[PDB]
Design a protein around this ligand. Structure first.
Ligand SMILES: C[C@@H]1O[C@@H](O)[C@@H](O)[C@H](O)[C@@H]1O
Ligand SMILES: C[C@@H]1O[C@@H](O)[C@@H](O)[C@H](O)[C@@H]1O
Lengths: 149, 149
């Protein structure tokens, strides 16, 4: 991790580098432990490792530096449950934490829910994919960078 | 240029990456236009280009993020005038700007002035050298990263 004034300690230099290189409209994926990171990163995005971190910690740190797009219906998206899981009535409480962290970063929008394969399509066009140690089911979240001022 | 909350826009992603990778005690050189950056970098330090910027502007931006070493007599050093120049009574006003920027970053120490070849020896062991477009004579400055606790 990095040691610079005003920069969250949990950010690695490679992640900071990725955030700095991203432009307006670019997206970054914070992937859970079960995400097919290896295959997705074969299609374009840079792979960044964050093995010992959970997503809530990382998300909070990223939002301290990353301005979110305010012109899209929602600058943050998660993967919606697959049919089997919806039928089973699966609960995904981690999403409540995401909504809370976004609010604290001044983002009043609600998370967008994308169908599995539609989520995978977006991930392939992402600038980078951060492989975390998040074990929560459906913990993946995609963020879209906006402009400053 | 970088577009991230709280980060000076004049820093390039490569420079930010270097600053994040440096550890306690590591040094970085902000070199003027007449510094032998190419030869010095052949000896170890990474070369980062910032040709369109002068040092005062870059120094201020760097000081906003980089903590300076405290257990050393002085964490900043410039190159002292060679016998020839000190014989012409050559002035070096930019140093006053450096002292001022350092003070504003809460560094009360005075600049350490190193003999030309001593300076080169230090530069060769530096983590990186930033080639700027600074035209001021003897504008080179070395900064030693401290700890953030
Ligand atoms: C069915 C989904 O498959 C991948 O997208 C995982 O990352 C999710 O957490 C979930 O298990
Ligand atoms: C004598 C010195 O030579 C190089 O180190 C230049 O970068 C300095 O500015 C000075 O001219």
């Amino acid at each position: 991790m990095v040691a610079l004034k005003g920069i969250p300690k949990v950010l690695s230099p490679e992640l900071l580098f990725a955030l700095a290189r991203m432009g307006h409209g670019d997206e970054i994926v914070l992937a859970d432990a079960n995400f097919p990171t290896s295959s997705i990163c074969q299609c374009g995005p840079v792979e960044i490792r964050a093995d010992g971190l959970d997503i809530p910690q990382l998300l909070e740190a990223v939002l301290r530096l990353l301005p979110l797009d305010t012109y899209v219906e929602s600058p943050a998206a998660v993967m919606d449950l697959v049919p089997s899981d919806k039928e089973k009535g699966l609960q995904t409480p981690i999403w409540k934490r995401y909504e809370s962290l976004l609010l604290e970063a001044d983002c009043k929008k609600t998370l967008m829910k994308l169908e599995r394969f539609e989520f995978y399509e977006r991930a392939k066009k992402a600038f980078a994919v951060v492989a975390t140690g998040e074990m929560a089911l459906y913990g993946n979240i995609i963020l879209k960078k906006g402009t400053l001022d």
